[PDB]
């Protein structure tokens with residue numbers, strides 16, 4: 001029911017200190033990318049999608065019906081880059097549940113490191129690093145950053 | 158080799174473009190930064206370090222690259238910095254060539270920069286496929 005194909009991503013906006021955090025999760029691996037955007041608008045979300053599309057083979061982006069995600073400028077970026085958009089209810093279990101859990105875990109890590117940085121965006125990037133490098137499943141287990149690169153490499157191969 | 162990166166700043170329309178190149182694959186990441194300072198370069202490095210296993214960053218002697226803030230980000234993330242000692246200079250020349258082709262298609266320079274990064278990394282294996290394979294086979 002939850003699409004874990006190598007090209008599937010879940011995106012959503014979370015909030016802290018009156019600021020907007022655009023977060024993306026590569027569903028199958030748990031790898032995340034986050035950015036603090038000045039406004040919760042299509043222009044900022046489309047620029048974020050353009051950057052994400054340049055690194056990974058993004059085939060599908062699952063979002064809620066938020067005005068920034070359903071905007072013309074996001075549709076133009078997804079269409080230009082060759083990405084499919086799927087809209088669902090905010091926090092729905094099939095297409096928004098993986099990003100819901102990642103946002104909750106991301107906020108927990110930001111709260112731990114917040115003291116270490118002056119700006120929120122810095123603490124957000126420190127928390128993204130900590131999340132993507134954390135090792136899951138036993139001592140010799142792999143991290144999200146290692147899982148994404150392996151999932152995509154074995155998908156190509 | 159799997160963790161070696163090169164960083165440099167190029168300029169267009171009075172704006173600063175911070176460009177990273179994964180030497181072994183030709184994969185690039187670029188960002189338009191408001192100022193050519195340590196703060197902007199350290200934030201960019203913090204983002205890059207979160208996706209790829211960056212072991213070394215090679216740069217020139219530019220004040221933004223030799224700053225205490227960049228050193229603090231590299232020390233925190235566990236990255237080694239090397240200064241002086243032309244992969245990024247060829248990538249900055251190719252990136253400007255692609256931006257010039259697509260510049261008409263976008264209003265903002267940053268958008269054209271990201272469109273050019275997409276075109277470069279997907280060209281085709283492609284630079285985007287080479288990085289992911291180099292790192293997966295390294296692991």
Ligand SMILES: Cc1ccc(-c2c([C@H](OC(C)(C)C)C(=O)O)c(C)nc3ccccc23)cc1
Pocket residue numbers: 116117118119122123126195196197199200203225226229230233
């Ligand atoms: C992991 C980490 C990296 C850099 C800093 C740092 C920051 C941070 O901001 C950015 C540069 C923009 C990343 C911040 O928000 O604290 C600042 C404003 N000045 C500094 C001065 C000296 C040493 C370090 C810094 C803090 C933590």
Ligand SMILES: Cc1ccc(-c2c([C@H](OC(C)(C)C)C(=O)O)c(C)nc3ccccc23)cc1
Pocket residue numbers: 042043044046047050072073076077080262263264265266268269272
């Ligand atoms: C690949 C691509 C995606 C979106 C645009 C786009 C932009 C651009 O900016 C971002 C939204 C921030 C990407 C830009 O700089 O031209 C703007 C300001 N208005 C639009 C209106 C209608 C359709 C598209 C756009 C341009 C290129």
Ligand SMILES: [Mg+2]
Pocket residue numbers: 012013064066090091
């Ligand atoms: Mg939402």
Ligand SMILES: [Mg+2]
Pocket residue numbers: 165166217219
């Ligand atoms: Mg220079």
